[PDB]
Curated annotation (Swiss-Prot), chain A:
<feature type="binding site">
    <location>
        <position position="290"/>
    </location>
    <ligand>
        <name>Mg(2+) 2</name>
    </ligand>
</feature>
<keyword id="KW-0092">Biotin</keyword>
<dbReference type="Pfam" id="PF00289">
    <property type="entry name" value="Biotin_carb_N"/>
</dbReference>
<dbReference type="GO" id="GO:0042803">
    <property type="term" value="F:protein homodimerization activity"/>
</dbReference>
<feature type="binding site">
    <location>
        <position position="276"/>
    </location>
    <ligand>
        <name>Mn(2+) 1</name>
    </ligand>
</feature>
<keyword id="KW-0436">Ligase</keyword>
<dbReference type="GO" id="GO:0006633">
    <property type="term" value="P:fatty acid biosynthetic process"/>
</dbReference>
<feature type="binding site">
    <location>
        <position position="338"/>
    </location>
    <ligand>
        <name>hydrogencarbonate</name>
    </ligand>
</feature>
<keyword id="KW-0479">Metal-binding</keyword>
<feature type="binding site">
    <location>
        <position position="116"/>
    </location>
    <ligand>
        <name>ATP</name>
    </ligand>
</feature>
<dbReference type="InterPro" id="IPR051602">
    <property type="entry name" value="ACC_Biotin_Carboxylase"/>
</dbReference>
<dbReference type="InterPro" id="IPR005479">
    <property type="entry name" value="CbamoylP_synth_lsu-like_ATP-bd"/>
</dbReference>
<dbReference type="InterPro" id="IPR005481">
    <property type="entry name" value="BC-like_N"/>
</dbReference>
<feature type="binding site">
    <location>
        <position position="288"/>
    </location>
    <ligand>
        <name>Mn(2+) 2</name>
    </ligand>
</feature>
<feature type="binding site">
    <location>
        <position position="288"/>
    </location>
    <ligand>
        <name>Mg(2+) 2</name>
    </ligand>
</feature>
<feature type="active site">
    <location>
        <position position="292"/>
    </location>
</feature>
<keyword id="KW-0275">Fatty acid biosynthesis</keyword>
């Protein structure tokens, strides 16, 4: 019944969604900005509609233009991908009210779980352990704020409730920096996400980032698809993700997986989502839920055989999961390296025209990207231009294949992080596995 | 497990040389690329640790230059040579010379190449082993036409003349009656002598309605052997394969086990070592042996997708003296995979299309695998086979595999030369291919 869907996104994820539609005989409508007319998926799409000028605020965040596009092409559903309006409760409400299927959760669920402050409360209520913190928004009373920081114990982190992508988070190591770190985060969050709401959380020094993939049909069925380790980070943003997570025992996998599946049923969750945790000394601590598909979804696909984009579409078309928990089986290992148009050392954005391009191939090699020779990477958007995912019968083979595939990958004409990713694959501690969320920056000697 | 071979010479070119190169690099084996003077810019040559030019462009002077190839191993201090497919891979003289010079032939023992590689000797052995063959001259044809007419009378007059030392569909002519017989034997002998340096021909009954079904084997040479399902390769032009798939449609679990066990038994009985394929004509529920490839095959990736076994790595493990790791009961068929060969030829007149590839884009996505050395800027030489790449698509079922293939072929861009991409698109759209079980004559009849 999903004859035509609007892909409310761009770049690599838009192409990912397009491919899934194409395989399923579903008509595609590519909505794009005036800077994105030459996107790969825009050229492969059945229909195209320019929804605004180059800036995201004036295009991909343009709610009325996106709905109008669905309206005028007579689409039935809208896939928001990740970022942009995918976790915008207002968007979902309006799409559904306009008579279109929103390929994601109900808006009440987006507001419960997509907003971080409310998410933590709902998880402390439902029987999921969280990181000790302010357990509410922070007020302007700075004596009250200091008491909190003393309860949980420095270092602490100030986090934006409406934040994402590593934005709106500042680490506080003592009272001397607390007032100004709160103020600057409120400001950064206000200008980046609207919402100036911030809370306080204990800053964990030695955890790993372990996240649990879930699918739920909104009819009372909910499964978990093992986990992903995403501990290799810079500026609180993921650089390498892998699945399964090393060193996670079957007893722990089942413990935490069942909690997340239970949480989904208890909240009536609908679609794909990810529960993100800080994992340290054998314990999981909930930090946030992404109520949407995630960038790193392919590594889970490769180890399970489950097509998560197709599953999202199954759920949106009103069909229950026909995958049961005992039918989920992990085989092998997959690693994903994000490819970013940025300086390999300074990490400042590198827009420009790609003058030469060559993609890697081979058994277990999966290249996810819209880039091509002669494609100009625009300055307006996130720097991630592609994803390289390698699968292998085991983790050593996955990493060996990634080294090989990074050696084949050519992207000339702009700076990229390919050199960085080769360095990480060659890191003896990454090869042993289980490095923490602070490792990459420590290795790079980043003050 | 034991240490891998330190260093190998890859004694081939094109897509199979790159495939072997990738396997070496995952296993930490150093690579030596021997190449002709026309192949300096091959992708695997550009990736190889060491390169040696073994002669000028013509294959006779380079990839068939036995002493140059062996000398190359010695100069680089390689310990083994992998012959790929074609060229010297089923040349028993080469395998002997390789061993007598102190290197490992990553292949069967030379004795086994003579027994099973030669088509006349292989028919004889299999018949003595109690393996059904196609009725035929059961011996080389001589020069007196009365005796040759008499053999055709016995078996029945669609007959085919086949070169004992032939391969790639070459050195084969169908004969409909007496009038054509003398000239057909004569032309087949002359073609064989020029192509394979062996003018030996035999006569076989020409089967009207069979499918091409072949069984993958893997033997450690120590007495253990397994099979890895079957492949159907019935879509052919000039008796050479165009599309391959695995598993073969209409082959049951019970039937697969029947033929697989017999092939595995045959390996133990003849002392086979390495990867191999037994090729059958499958007609009226019965298998009839036609040949054994005593080497890796072009289409090995379809079997890898549906079994998870890395056939090249297994070749290298076995050549390192490792016994088979994989037991028969560990081998499981999952899903379905299709391969479309990509050839630089006119899609309609099949005229060779050498030249510079000016634009190139590989297909990507879940379940899509691309096996090719080609790149934008690369010149396809006129000296060698037209096959420039292989596209392989996997799905949870055959319908999914075929829809994915369609889409992948549509994404593929190769400008500058003519290719058969458009024929493969016609084939995926063919109602009878979609049905399955089309016979070996279908593609040419469709045309
Ligand atoms: N709440 C949000 N609002 C707007 N954009 C977001 C939000 N969360 C994430 N994004 C954006 O979506 C993209 C993917 O986010 P990222 O955190 O890199 O991946 P993931 O969370 O899927 O692992 C980034 O460009 C990021 O800035
Ligand atoms: N309490 C904490 N202690 C230590 N690190 C944290 C904490 N909260 C977040 N982080 C760091 O920031 C990363 C992203 O956290 P998250 O809350 O999911 O932010 P985002 O919304 O940007 O995805 C984590 O992987 C971790 O490295
Ligand atoms: N006995 C042989 N002598 C020389 N070349 C061969 C021989 N057998 C196969 N080839 C070549 O090897 C390549 C692969 O053979 P082909 O028949 O296409 O694949 P396969 O038999 O692996 O399915 C082709 O170029 C073919 O011409
Ligand atoms: N007896 C036969 N009757 C009909 N077709 C045949 C026969 N033998 C071979 N062929 C056709 O030629 C193809 C190649 O046969 P094969 O002996 O494997 O030659 P090659 O060494 O060239 O691979 C087969 O797949 C089949 O389609
Ligand atoms: Mg997060
Ligand atoms: Mg053959």
């Amino acid at each position: 019944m999903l004859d035509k869907i609007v892909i409310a996104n761009r770049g690599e994820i838009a192409l990912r969604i397009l491919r899934a539609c194409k395989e399923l005989g579903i008509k595609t409508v590519a909505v794009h900005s005036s800077a994105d007319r030459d996107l790969k998926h825009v050229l492969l799409a059945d229909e195209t509609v320019c929804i605004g000028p180059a800036p995201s605020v004036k295009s991909y965040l343009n709610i009325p233009a996106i709905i109008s596009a669905a309206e005028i092409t007579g689409a039935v559903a809208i896939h928001p991908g990740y970022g942009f309006l995918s976790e915008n409760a207002n968007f979902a409400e309006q799409v559904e009210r306009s008579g279109f299927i929103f390929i994601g959760p109900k808006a009440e669920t987006i507001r419960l779980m997509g907003d971080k402050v409310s998410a933590i409360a709902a998880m402390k209520k439902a029987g999921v352990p969280c990181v000790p913190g302010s357990d509410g928004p922070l007020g302007d009373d700075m004596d009250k704020n200091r008491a909190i920081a003393k309860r949980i114990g420095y270092p602490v982190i100030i986090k934006a409730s409406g934040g994402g992508g590593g934005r709106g988070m500042r680490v506080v190591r003592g009272d001397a920096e607390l007032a100004q770190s709160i103020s600057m985060t409120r400001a950064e969050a206000k200008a980046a996400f609207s919402n100036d709401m911030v809370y306080m959380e204990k800053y964990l020094e030695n955890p790993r980032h372990v996240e649990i993939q879930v699918l739920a049909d909104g009819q009372g069925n909910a499964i978990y698809l093992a986990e992903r380790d995403c501990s290799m980070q810079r500026r609180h943003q993921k650089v390498v993700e892998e699945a399964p997570a090393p060193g996670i025992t079957p007893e722990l996998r089942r413990y935490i997986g069942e909690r997340c599946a239970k949480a989904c049923v208890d909240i009536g969750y609908r679609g794909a989502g990810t529960f993100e945790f800080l994992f340290e000394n054998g314990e999981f601590y909930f930090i946030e839920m992404n109520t949407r598909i995630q960038v790193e979804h392919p590594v889970t696909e490769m180890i399970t055989g489950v097509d998560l984009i197709k599953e999202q579409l199954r759920i949106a078309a009103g069909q229950p999961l026909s995958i049961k928990q005992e039918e989920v089986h992990v085989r092998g290992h997959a690693v994903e390296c994000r490819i970013n148009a940025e300086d390999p050392n300074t990490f400042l954005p590198s827009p420009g025209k790609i003058t030469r391009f060559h993609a890697p191939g081979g058994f277990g090699v999966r290249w996810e990207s819209h880039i091509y020779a002669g494609y100009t990477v625009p300055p307006y958007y996130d720097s991630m231009i592609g994803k390289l995912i390698c699968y292998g019968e085991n983790r050593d083979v996955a990493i060996a294949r990634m080294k090989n595939a990074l050696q084949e990958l050519i992207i000339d004409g702009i700076k990229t992080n390919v050199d960085l990713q080769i360095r990480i694959m060659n890191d003896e501690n990454f090869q042993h596995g289980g490095t923490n969320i602070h490792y990459l920056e420590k290795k790079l000697g980043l003050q």
